[PDB]
Amino acid sequence: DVSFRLSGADPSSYGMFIKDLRNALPHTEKVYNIPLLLPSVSGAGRYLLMHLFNYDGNTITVAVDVTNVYIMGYLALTTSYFFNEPAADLASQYVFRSARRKITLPYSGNYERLQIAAGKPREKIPIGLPALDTAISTLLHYDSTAAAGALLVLIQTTAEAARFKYIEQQIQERAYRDEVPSSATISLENSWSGLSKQIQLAQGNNGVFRTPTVLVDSKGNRVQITNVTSNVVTSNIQLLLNTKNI
Ligand SMILES: *[C@@H]1O[C@H](CO)[C@@H](O[C@@H]2O[C@H](CO)[C@@H](O)[C@H](O)[C@H]2NC(C)=O)[C@H](O)[C@H]1NC(C)=O
Ligand SMILES: C[C@H]1O[C@H](O)[C@H](O)[C@@H](O)[C@H]1O
Numbered sequence: 081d082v083s084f085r086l087s088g089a090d091p092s093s094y095g096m097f098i099k100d101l102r103n104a105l106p107h108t109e110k111v112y113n114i115p116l117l118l119p120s121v122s123g124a125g126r127y128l129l130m131h132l133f134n135y136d137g138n139t140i141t142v143a144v145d146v147t148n149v150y151i152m153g154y155l156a157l158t159t160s161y162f163f164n165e166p167a168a169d170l171a172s173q174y175v176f177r178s179a180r181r182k183i184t185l186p187y188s189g190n191y192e193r194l195q196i197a198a199g200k201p202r203e204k205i206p207i208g209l210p211a212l213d214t215a216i217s218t219l220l221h222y223d224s225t226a227a228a229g230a231l232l233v234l235i236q237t238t239a240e241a242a243r244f245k246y247i248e249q250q251i252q253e254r255a256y257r258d259e260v261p262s263s264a265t266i267s268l269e270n271s272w273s274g275l276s277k278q279i280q281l282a283q284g285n286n287g288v289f290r291t292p293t294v295l296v297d298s299k300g301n302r303v304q305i306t307n308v309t310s311n312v313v314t315s316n317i318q319l320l321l322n323t324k325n326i
Contacts (some may be wrong), residue, residue, distance in 0.1 A: 081141075083131040084238075086213040091252040094209060101242040102318055104128050105146050111280055111320055112287070112308045118147050119324035124174040127152065130238060134216040142234065143175040148321055149239040151189060151231070155179055156220045161227070163189035186224050189231075191269070197228035205232055207261055208254025212237040236261060236269065244268045246316045267296035268316075275305070275312065276321035282308050 082104050084097035105128065107115040120126075128144040142154040145167065152171035153162030160179035162168040165188040172182060187193040195201050215230035215237070241248040247265050261269075271293050278289035287308040295312065297303045305312055 081129040081131055083133070085133040085137075086135045086209065086216065087133065087137060089209055089255070091255050094252055094255065095248065098238075098241050098248045101128075101130065101144075101238060105149065105242070105319060111283055112313060114279065114313075114317060114320050116280070116320045117149075117322050117325075119322045121146055127171055127175050129175070132212075132216050132234075132238075134220075135213050136217075138217065138220055140216055140219050141176070142238070143171055144239065145171065148325055149242055149319060151235055151239060153185075154219060159183060159222065161185055161219070161222065163187065165189055183222060185227065187228060189235075191232070191235075194228045194232050194235075197225065198232060199225070200229065202232045202236065202261065203263075203266060204260060205229060206254075206258035207233050207236050208251060208256075208258035209237075210256065211254070211258040212251075236265075240265075240269050240272075243272055243319050244316050245318055246312075262298065263296045263300060264298050267294075268312075271295055272317075273321055273326050275317055277323050277326050278305075279308060279313060279317070279320055280323045 082100045106118055109116040126145055128146050130142040130144060131139060133139045140154045140156045143152045145152055152168040153160060155176040158180035160176035160182045162172045162184050164184050187197045211233045215233040218226050218230035237251055241251050247268060250265055274293050278293055281290040282288055289306050293305040295303050295305055
């Protein structure tokens with residue numbers, strides 16, 4: 081399992097949590113020196129437990145599918161909560177069975193359904209450490225509309241940060257002040273599968289992408305990623321979704 085505490089958190093302890101989150105995801109292979117996520121893991125070993133503690137020390141346990149860094153649901157006190165999707169329903173066979181009751185959230189876990197549910201695009205939702213603290217707090221007591229916002233914040237702060245060094249650094253900057261994610265952050269979240277695929281295709285194609293990946297950069301304008309010499313490949317992405325899951 082991995083644990084992160086908001087109390088006393090700072091850019092460093094957060095970096096250590098995301099490090100720990102990355103290192104908890106199993107891989108047998110590195111493709112261009114990036115850990116390649118497994119095609120599948122059967123039964124209960126498929127799910128990483130993240131113990132998150134708000135500033136008060138209240139806690140939730142989040143279950144993450146180790147093959148795609150996809151949050152499936154969480155446990156708050158004696159209630160489990162799972163997204164309304166088959167993968168999460170499958171996950172509820174394995175994690176948090178000790179929960180007194182189980183609530184299936186009225187949405188899947190994808191960004192589009194979460195945003196509709198939250199009433200805001202994640203462009204307009206501040207993130208950072210104080211926001212993760214809020215999110216953990218919200219998730220402690222069921223409220224499906226508020227939880228959708230809290231989940232968008234939680235996805236971005238833990239999974240998307242594990243997947244991209246740039247997003248981990250975005251959050252580290254937002255250790256004590258939330259701020260909506262940069263467009264570059266949104267571009268990376270949305271491009272992960274894409275990049276994961278083209279990194280893998282590049283092996284066999286001389287480090288060249290079969291199809292370029294359009295991103296937005298820090299300064300704000302589109303940029304086309306075409307091979308593995310690109311910074312986003314050499315420095316930024318930290319985990320590759322296996323093409324068997326794309
Ligand atoms: C691999 O990717 C790099 C970009 O990351 C390519 O080099 C860039 O592209 C053009 C020049 O051809 C310029 O717009 C950039 O400023 C270049 N940047 C750097 C840092 O060199 C490179 O051409 C690509 N190589 C292959 C074989 O596709
Ligand atoms: C859109 C996806 O972003 C990440 O992959 C999360 O882990 C998933 O739960 C889903 O929200």
